[PDB]
Amino acid sequence: AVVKCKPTSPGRRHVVKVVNPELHKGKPFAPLLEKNSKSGGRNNNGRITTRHIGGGHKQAYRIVDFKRNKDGIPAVVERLEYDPNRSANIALVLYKDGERRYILAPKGLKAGDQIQSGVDAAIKPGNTLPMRNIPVGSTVHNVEMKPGKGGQLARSAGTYVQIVARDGAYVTLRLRSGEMRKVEADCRATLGEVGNAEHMLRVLGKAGAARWRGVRPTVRGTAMNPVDHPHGGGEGRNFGKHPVTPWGVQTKGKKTRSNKRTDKFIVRRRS
Amino acid sequence: MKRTFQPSVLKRNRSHGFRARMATKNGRQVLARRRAKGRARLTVSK
RNA sequence: GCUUGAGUCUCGUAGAGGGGGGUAGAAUUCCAGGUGUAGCGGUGAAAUGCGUAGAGAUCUGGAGGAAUACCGGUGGCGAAGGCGGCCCCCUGGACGAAGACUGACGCUCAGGUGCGAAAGCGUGGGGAGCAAACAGGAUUAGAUACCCUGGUAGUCCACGCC
RNA sequence: CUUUAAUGUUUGAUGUUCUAACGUUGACCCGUAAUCCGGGUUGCGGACAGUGUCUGGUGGGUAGUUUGACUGGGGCGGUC
RNA sequence: AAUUCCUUGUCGGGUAAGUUCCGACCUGCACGAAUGGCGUAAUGAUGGCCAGGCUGUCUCCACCCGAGACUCAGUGAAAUUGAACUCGCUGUGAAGAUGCAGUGUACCCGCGGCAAGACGGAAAGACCCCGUGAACCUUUACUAUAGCUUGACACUGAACA
RNA sequence: GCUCGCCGGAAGACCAAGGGUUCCUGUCCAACGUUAAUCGGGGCAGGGUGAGUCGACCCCUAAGGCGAGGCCGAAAGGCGUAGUCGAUGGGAAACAGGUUAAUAUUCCUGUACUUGGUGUUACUGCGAAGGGGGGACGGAGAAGGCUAUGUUGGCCGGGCGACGGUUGUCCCGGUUUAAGCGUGUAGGCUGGUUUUCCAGGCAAAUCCGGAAAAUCAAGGCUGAGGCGUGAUGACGAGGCACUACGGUGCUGAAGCAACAAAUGCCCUGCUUCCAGGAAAAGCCUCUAAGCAUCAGGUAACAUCAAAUCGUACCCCAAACCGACACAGGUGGUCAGGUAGAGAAUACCAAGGCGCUUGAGAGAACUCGGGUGAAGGAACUAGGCAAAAUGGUGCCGUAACUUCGGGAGAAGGCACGCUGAUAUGUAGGUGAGGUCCCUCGCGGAUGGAGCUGAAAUCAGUCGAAGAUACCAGCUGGCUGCAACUGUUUAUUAAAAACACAGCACUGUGCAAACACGAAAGUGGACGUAUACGGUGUGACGCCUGCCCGGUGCCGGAAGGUUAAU
RNA sequence: AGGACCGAACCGACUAAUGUUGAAAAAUUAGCGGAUGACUUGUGGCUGGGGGUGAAAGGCCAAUCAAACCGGGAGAUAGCU
């Protein structure tokens, strides 16, 4: 659960840790590891393109099954592991033919649970099926946008998607943003919601925790100069014009969505 | 006081060397200008 | 020592007693659509407000939240606060015919501990109606009110406080 | 000549369906013991998206500049 | 008050004496609620004030120990510089005189010191003004323009109301 | 040459980078050395750098670079697949003595070790830009076992002390010895063996993974250090013959034990934490295509090969970066004695220097210090500067608080030496013995030696005992910023910036946004508990009213309105 | 355990004095801040000039920065000296 630290020092005064004793203490599964090198704030042109990304802890990428397959083969769940690359925890699962894979761990999943992925799979948290064998109203996660592509929606910790309706070839989904959108019914979805729902309850306590995450300091345009930001300047604190991005586009309000080939799929815009 | 020139022959040859000049057409123009001027050493780094 | 106070067992009975989950039916609101036109709403009167970009009214489909009309009672249960749709799971108490058992094991209890309406506070959600604050329109000599039109916290859920 | 539930026969606005251009940063096969890219099979979208030319708006995000003179220094005021 | 012009506002405390300080009042020139308001333990090479200790900080300097400065031998620069036979005073004067006029004073030349002057040296004043000068920055200045966005045509076709 | 001083976690020793002959010898003193110079990093000549084991090269990869084709782009060119480069990282192997004027793990002596080629013999399924294992990995903390190393004793050699005493519990010196081979231990990790089956590993597999049976907890792997061998060897204090006094040669005694020890090793271990900690090859194993007394793979023996380049010298510096023989800068490694917590500091070892102008004299004034009567901030813008305090143990400690703090609050007391407790105690370490076990790097009892605080009584010295160096000033009231941090490298370190938190807003993934003329790339191998932009800035209590103006969001009825 | 405390190496630069034709085109001396972390450092790489990078000062980009340096237009122009 959440652990409020004793204020033995400033920086430990205001930190809440979320700790899971169920998580595996030790090395991850080495056949499903890849090299992950830091490249944020670095284009192939070498320029910073996303600001406030820099050095954090070294991390290794875990190959997680998102396009879940091996239909009809049950898999027993071994110990849940920690994943630095995402807010969610992951589960190392072992199929009956001797194949280990990494799964986005749902909320109720424990070590020893059985999961399955086919069209004959019983509907149960941790099982994935296309959304024409899944009843309307169930909360799902790790749901594809195209049939066979892999889960793109509800991958963060604690997130879920509600199956609201069925067209007959499309399935309407209420997303975590409140948006309703039409997704094809042959797209697969894992049942239940994603675990680690206490991830939003952590408070980092100090600037060093953000630096271990990998977030470089954010400078305000009011603190900058007129050459640097559209905000900036003045012989006091007040600038006094409409708030904008560093490149001039207005940032309070001003919806910026220019897609026209997916407007047929978004049904109700998020509120 | 740390001064601006901190020598390293590897970085010298990677930055200003003959093959670094010959890689780009503009460094080949540098070498053409130095042969036309008549320098005793084309790439003084090398 | 005794059972006659207190308690236990057998078999039943009624009950919105509590905790968890699921579901159902009216109705309100909102969205999309069909018909249709010049008013709707409100009040002691009006007016703010909605409607000429089509409101209100009628019908269809969908979404979401809250409370459970009738039964309903000078009824029932719980120590109190309190508890009302239906179904399941776990569970507390009360009462009764009859029989058996232990044998004063009882009563009250300052400190102590627990429970404790509504309002309020913290974190995370939810938000249909209602509604402190707030705004407008009335009333009045004035009206920081009673009235109307909206409307935020809150009312709802989880865990903690008080 | 203003109109007809089959005929001599056009133009312009949304709406629905199709596939066959186009898209695919869906799946599979081959080049190929290649995350590229082609070609092929199929699924999805589909005359939409996107691009070219023309065009209305917005546009200190950039760019070039202007922002007068007299004046009992200049500026303010006043004047031309 | 990092905010109050008047202003050293007024009252209280601290001091023998306090334009600063602390606590108040409200008469807020011209505080005020994420341009955040008020408070806040801890923290600070942060700003102001007070006190104990401590002392050459001072009254008010004295002595001593070293490195220079001074002399000798060796080596040996620099800024600057129209030329110099390069005094004081008062007046005059492009208006603050070593040089002009009147006058006074002064044998010639070093060495160690001090800096009052040579409007001393250094840097074609940076403040001010001027140039139909420059740069950069701003905007609601003018004119464009990247981007974003609107529509027509083309790529681009077939049916049905 | 003899004294004197200075450094000694360097001002000593060895490298890397960088430099490029400054290295050694002979000769010269014009110029260069801030002076002279017989000297020199100067001039002129010669000499000097010896590798299968050190490094490079080489095999392998990270960031990244280039990139056949390819995609894109007026051209130039941009990106990028296969691939190929790229160490700062990962794979074979050598140590000790001796030697030169100058080389040294390279030459010599002694003892080794590794990787390939070929040939002979014996056995046999060998075979891959393929699969699997392994390489292969974080921070912090805590043991234990050691070792480098040091001290003391023994032993050996020498001494018998310019001035009282001294060798007859004294003085000085030495007491060294490696790789390799064998043993496989203080530890650490892990259950092995056999059989059967397979929806997995881009196909196959006896390999990996998975499942099911019998058997016993005894098998394997890793691992410092010790001991034996290396080694009756080498080295070794001194002594002995020739001296041109550079020095050469012979001989060469003891060469043990105990204790204290690392920040080094076991240890890439163990424990714990979240921030979740490179890649590929060398190595092992499995088969695919192929071949069958063939080619190959193992084991033994013999023989051959290991090329090429670097190697001098400086390297907290007079050889590098700073125009200088410049008070500056420069990565790693080694780490002695006494006091000490210590890599502080003081004095010294080994070693290296006295900083390339001296000699006088003892003015002002300047710089760097020492001490001051009485007063004690009266100085000044301001306690600027100086002075002060400073250690360990124990007692004691306020308001306020977010309960952690504040706090070393403040303020005090004792510190030296000697003796006794105790001819050296508590503790630490552990030989001779004694008894067991599959009798060896084994276990149990001891308790000889060695080392050894701290405390209490008593005595004693000085003015003074944390006596030197070293080493904190303290308290109160306020502004600001929560804090640690960052900042104008060269006049501003702040109240500025950042910050954890908070909120608004955009964003449904081919996301927003950014770089790009486009491909593409970041965002992100992320997916609304995520990402961006903005403002505010822990925390506590809160954040009121105004949508008229300017932005933004929503709507299209009417007016105006472009190309066409 | 801790962006914990004291304090060396290490990193930095708050005060004062000296130096200001310096020993030094920013240092020395005496103190001073951090010193397990948002630390520090070696080697190599990447980002290129209306551009980069910036815990933001218009700081930094080779002793050069409100637009680097080199070459060219170029003998720019200069109603000014």
Side-chain angles (χ1 to χ4, degrees):
Chain A
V2 304
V3 176
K4 183 62 161 193
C5 291
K6 297 286 194 73
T8 65
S9 63
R12 299 291 288 182
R13 170 81 89 199
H14 294 302
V15 54
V16 165
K17 302 159 69 175
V18 296
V19 63
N20 217 33
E22 184 178 1
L23 286 191
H24 179 232
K25 291 174 167 61
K27 294 292 141 273
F29 194 55
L32 286 153
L33 280 175
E34 260 177 29
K35 179 205 91 197
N36 203 12
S37 283
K38 309 207 164 311
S39 296
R42 164 152 86 180
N43 203 6
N44 57 352
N45 296 349
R47 316 271 197 89
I48 73 170
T49 48
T50 306
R51 306 192 296 161
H52 319 115
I53 307 182
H57 206 291
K58 170 138 82 153
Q59 299 157 13
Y61 189 68
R62 280 132 192 97
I63 305 148
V64 166
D65 213 349
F66 292 113
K67 34 191 284 188
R68 290 184 62 187
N69 301 125
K70 307 286 290 296
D71 291 340
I73 301 106
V76 66
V77 176
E78 323 198 309
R79 286 187 66 85
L80 322 174
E81 315 206 328
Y82 178 86
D83 208 0
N85 318 112
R86 64 200 83 246
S87 60
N89 295 313
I90 57 184
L92 184 61
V93 307
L94 168 65
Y95 286 88
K96 294 292 221 143
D97 45 4
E99 197 197 351
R100 267 170 205 83
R101 279 194 194 188
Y102 270 126
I103 297 299
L104 268 190
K107 184 175 75 177
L109 209 72
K110 254 83 192 173
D113 295 1
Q114 303 290 116
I115 58 165
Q116 218 176 335
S117 65
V119 302
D120 309 334
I123 53 173
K124 206 193 71 63
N127 287 328
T128 197
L129 297 101
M131 292 157 153
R132 50 168 80 260
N133 310 344
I134 307 192
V136 167
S138 62
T139 67
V140 290
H141 75 275
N142 201 49
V143 64
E144 317 183 332
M145 291 197 179
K146 293 186 183 183
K149 202 176 156 161
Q152 280 156 291
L153 295 174
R155 298 166 78 254
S156 197
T159 55
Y160 55 97
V161 173
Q162 272 144 20
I163 299 184
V164 162
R166 283 186 185 176
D167 170 90
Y170 278 73
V171 165
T172 312
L173 303 175
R174 180 163 30 226
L175 308 161
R176 205 61 174 73
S177 59
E179 190 193 279
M180 302 265 188
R181 72 164 277 121
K182 284 212 141 193
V183 173
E184 190 174 359
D186 308 74
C187 303
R188 292 159 79 105
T190 317
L191 289 164
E193 44 176 292
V194 183
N196 202 350
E198 66 263 14
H199 164 77
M200 65 182 179
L201 287 184
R202 65 170 92 240
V203 63
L204 280 71
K206 67 176 197 182
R211 298 307 288 274
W212 310 329
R213 257 76 190 195
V215 186
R216 288 253 307 148
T218 295
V219 193
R220 306 177 272 104
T222 43
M224 304 190 187
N225 266 297
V227 64
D228 297 314
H229 208 269
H231 315 148
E235 297 295 320
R237 271 202 179 115
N238 267 328
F239 181 53
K241 283 210 89 60
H242 297 122
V244 287
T245 61
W247 308 276
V249 189
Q250 206 257 337
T251 188
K252 305 267 173 150
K254 192 69 179 66
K255 53 191 52 164
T256 53
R257 169 187 160 88
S258 164
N259 214 354
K260 289 182 165 174
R261 62 175 222 282
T262 61
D263 278 32
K264 65 177 96 85
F265 297 135
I266 296 89
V267 164
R268 213 202 51 91
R269 195 250 191 200
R270 53 94 181 170
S271 59
Chain B
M1 295 300 290
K2 186 176 170 178
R3 294 269 95 89
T4 51
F5 184 47
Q6 299 298 324
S8 173
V9 311
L10 172 65
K11 285 170 69 173
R12 183 162 195 82
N13 287 346
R14 293 181 184 271
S15 191
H16 309 288
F18 177 75
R19 298 185 40 85
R21 292 280 147 83
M22 291 295 278
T24 317
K25 69 97 180 174
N26 286 311
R28 292 196 298 274
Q29 291 200 321
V30 161
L31 295 185
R33 284 197 311 261
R34 293 181 73 85
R35 294 179 217 264
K37 198 177 180 79
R39 311 306 291 244
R41 304 181 281 290
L42 275 185
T43 46
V44 295
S45 297
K46 167 61 192 57

